[PDB]
Amino acid sequence: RFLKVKNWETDVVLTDTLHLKSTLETGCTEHICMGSIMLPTKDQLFPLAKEFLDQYYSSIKRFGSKAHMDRLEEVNKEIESTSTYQLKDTELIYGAKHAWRNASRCVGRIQWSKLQVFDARDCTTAHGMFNYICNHVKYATNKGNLRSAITIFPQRTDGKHDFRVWNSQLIRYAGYKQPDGSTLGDPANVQFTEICIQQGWKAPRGRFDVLPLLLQANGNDPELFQIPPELVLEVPIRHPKFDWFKDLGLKWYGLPAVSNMLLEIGGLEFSACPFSGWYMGTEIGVRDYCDNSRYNILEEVAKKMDLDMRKTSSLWKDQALVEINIAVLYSFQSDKVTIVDHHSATESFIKHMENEYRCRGGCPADWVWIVPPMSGSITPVFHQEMLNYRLTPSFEYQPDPWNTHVW
Amino acid sequence: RFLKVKNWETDVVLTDTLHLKSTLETGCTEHICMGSIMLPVRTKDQLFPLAKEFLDQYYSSIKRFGSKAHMDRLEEVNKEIESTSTYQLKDTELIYGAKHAWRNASRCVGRIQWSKLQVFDARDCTTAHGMFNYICNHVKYATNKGNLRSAITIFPQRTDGKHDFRVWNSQLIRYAGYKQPDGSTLGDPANVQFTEICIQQGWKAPRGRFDVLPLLLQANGNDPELFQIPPELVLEVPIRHPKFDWFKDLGLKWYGLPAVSNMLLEIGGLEFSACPFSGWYMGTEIGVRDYCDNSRYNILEEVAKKMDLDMRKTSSLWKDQALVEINIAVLYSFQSDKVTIVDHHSATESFIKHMENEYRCRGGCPADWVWIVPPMSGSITPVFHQEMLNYRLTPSFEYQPDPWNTHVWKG
Ligand code: HEM
Ligand code: HEM
Ligand SMILES: C[C@H](O)[C@H](O)[C@H]1CNc2nc(N)[nH]c(=O)c2N1
Ligand SMILES: C[C@H](O)[C@H](O)[C@H]1CNc2nc(N)[nH]c(=O)c2N1
Ligand SMILES: CCSCC(=N)NCCC[C@H](N)C(=O)O
Ligand SMILES: CCSCC(=N)NCCC[C@H](N)C(=O)O
Ligand SMILES: [Zn+2]
């Protein structure tokens, strides 16, 4: 019931008590560990509300005050009468910051308290959502000096009136099946590109087409909008020594903005809540460029470097991988777009972990996601034991809406 | 209950039923995952079920379940347990059991080979000098002049827990570590404690960077005794790089035979607390961890210096660049001297084939993702993209406390 985590590089031992406030379920049992699996009424709502308000008032040091008791009463009345309730601005801001604080898969949480929250609960239409999103994008991009942000659309009501951003990120490249048999662009986005085209998008059928937004307001059919091109900051990829690297024609976008998740605060569900930070280099260089199922560029880069590809043991994949990641970091830095390398990011998160153990008594962390997808053991997180558990407020996955939406 | 695991690169979905046969617990609950935690005297009453369970598995494996020979062996073990409170494995059951502990080892990426294990039965051993002889034979057989062969040597099982056989070394061959008065370490810092014990026991330490430790051996619960492995039996590889001629002047070498000697083998309820086993290396074990961990030989700085990398900013990825070159050097060196080694691409690809085959033939393959994925270049290996289920099957290899913490000294 009191848990120890050891760092095997420093022998530093931390005690976790925070997990005893864990609410949701991990997917594991005492017989089976599922730690590597990607996706493991009025009655229910009031304990959820109480639980959240109790943590809020405790956080502002007014636990058990008349203002605490009165708000609990007020929310209680509002649920009994309206079957839902409304968060105050202060509660909304706190809930969002804490959903990020609690995000066990995010290595960037040292920044959690600096989140800029945009309250879009007054939004009613898809055009309104489009306006709010462009403002988020411009505010967060900030001409390269990226700032964390979240934009929060109206909460779920009866689930017939859901706000959804159909895109998985605000900014992504299209993917196209070809006559050829191969795939043009980002293969991760093929099906959603199909949803766009069949809703009316004119696709330019290129390698790096920024997808249009597909926005659903109040449970209505979603609508298309193109993000103003001038708000989509992109970086051409060059290498500081390989002059030929630019010839690959590679680019990426500056703003990582996950848009398909659901924010749960005090039992309330915010199904459209796009949020954004800034990239750790490996995300693009290792995953987006090198996954066999993504742009899968390792072979081409290796060929240009004139490496011996005859045998896996020459570590040619590994050599090319490093150089690709050097090029990503270099290119963002040259153009002054915020980016973090995996050494600096993991080092930060270790400091965040210690802070959180000292000030909060724990920090839920999914080791499988936190350890970078290259050079794992030369980053300190590799040697850090982590406990994974589910605290609320939280960001949760949710079904893709085209599987659900009734047209 | 069927459990599905998905590969996110290939969209292959597999179905696990094997997990239903799981007995032991993981450390995880519905409320907490401890998947990254390194480490999360029996009764007659508890012994016969474990015996029975194991022998039902044995007799099923050989297609003789419910045979007269199966029933007779149950009755005989039952009677032996009641009369003597323990029981002896037949040779065949011991072989089968040891193979299966390997097969069930969820942190082992080398399991495609599980069926080819050479088992040396050392249950007639009575003394530390006897153990030493068994261990030299194992090292020489397994080395095979660089063409490595998997092997396990099995010493007598636990009885009352007061007469345990133990190998006090953590591997049969490992380098000494010496803490210096200035706080620096010479040699391998992982082995400082065990080295200090060896010196206290009377080993004359050469005190260099790569001194092969003496075997420290406990038989039948007695105080352990020191033995030097004959040097001619210790195959080592000097490390050089195919393109960088200064690489050899770092003075690096490593030993070719990895042989874990500190784990406990459980078969049918019985505890074999000395069962050293050995295979061959995957290159990253040496080039990533043994060489580049901060708490091990820690050579990354010195290497990147010699490479003239830009070291002022981590964002040049100098560490990642040096790491690759060291790993190329390790693999090149072993291959040039014809010592068995496997690269991390080749090993993980093999494991993925092994895992699929295991699902089809056995209904599962317990695997620990945290351990299986290599400590460099994770996502360009297919295992990174493979969902896995971790659970504990018997027979199994288990951790056990270090013997110097529990041993009752006789003097
Ligand atoms: C500010 C700089 C930030 C950095 C450097 C960062 C870093 C990362 C990284 C590397 C991942 C892994 C993503 C992947 O592998 O696909 C991740 C995941 C995640 N992050 Fe952050 N993050 C930042 C900001 C934020 C913000 C502002 C939020 C929420 C307000 C957030 C919440 C999450 C969540 C929920 C995940 C898991 C998403 C999923 O499961 O796909 N992050 N983060
Ligand atoms: C045939 C060649 C083999 C290869 C390539 C191989 C590969 C590996 C690797 C890379 C590890 C991780 C080691 C670490 O990080 O310290 C490991 C662990 C392990 N292997 Fe294998 N292995 C082989 C043979 C065997 C054999 C013969 C056995 C037993 C009969 C075995 C049982 C285990 C066990 C129990 C572990 C976990 C050790 C621990 O928890 O410290 N392996 N293996
Ligand atoms: C099967 C496995 O869980 C899957 O490949 C995970 C592993 N770790 C990850 N880690 C991060 N940060 N992002 C990912 O998409 C993944 N994928
Ligand atoms: C805390 C963490 O589990 C620890 O560093 C693990 C991670 N994965 C590992 N994987 C292997 N193969 N070997 C190890 O020693 C470790 N160390
Ligand atoms: C937006 C909250 S977390 C910020 C981040 N750094 N990454 C998010 C995911 C981006 C994805 N892995 C990609 O490579 O596009
Ligand atoms: C002996 C059974 S598993 C064989 C193996 N390939 N590795 C064992 C551990 C070796 C350790 N990592 C080292 O670097 O010495
Ligand atoms: Zn688990």
UniProtKB/Swiss-Prot annotation, chain B:
Locations listed in the record: Cell membrane, Sarcolemma; Cell projection, Dendritic spine
Domain of life, source organism: Eukaryota
Residues represented out of the complete protein: 299 to 718 of 1429
Binding site for L-arginine: Q171, W280, Y281, E285
Organism: Rattus norvegicus
Expression by tissue: Isoform N-NOS-1 is expressed in brain and colorectum. Found in the Auerbach's plexus of the enteric nervous system. Isoform PNNOS is expressed in the penis, urethra, prostate, and skeletal muscle, and coexists with the cerebellar nnos in the pelvic plexus, bladder and liver, and is detectable in the cerebellum.
Subunit text: Homodimer. Interacts with DLG4 (via N-terminal tandem pair of PDZ domains); the interaction possibly being prevented by the association between NOS1 and CAPON. Forms a ternary complex with CAPON and RASD1. Forms a ternary complex with CAPON and SYN1. Interacts with ZDHHC23. Interacts with NOSIP; which may impair its synaptic location. Interacts with HTR4. Interacts with SLC6A4. Interacts with VAC14.
Effect listed in the UniProt record for changing Y281S: 30% decrease of nitric-oxide synthase activity
Domain-related comment: The PDZ domain participates in protein-protein interaction, and is responsible for targeting nNos to synaptic membranes. Mediates interaction with VAC14.
Family: Belongs to the NOS family.
Documented effect of changing Y281F: No decrease in nitric-oxide synthase activity
Name of the protein this chain belongs to: Nitric oxide synthase 1
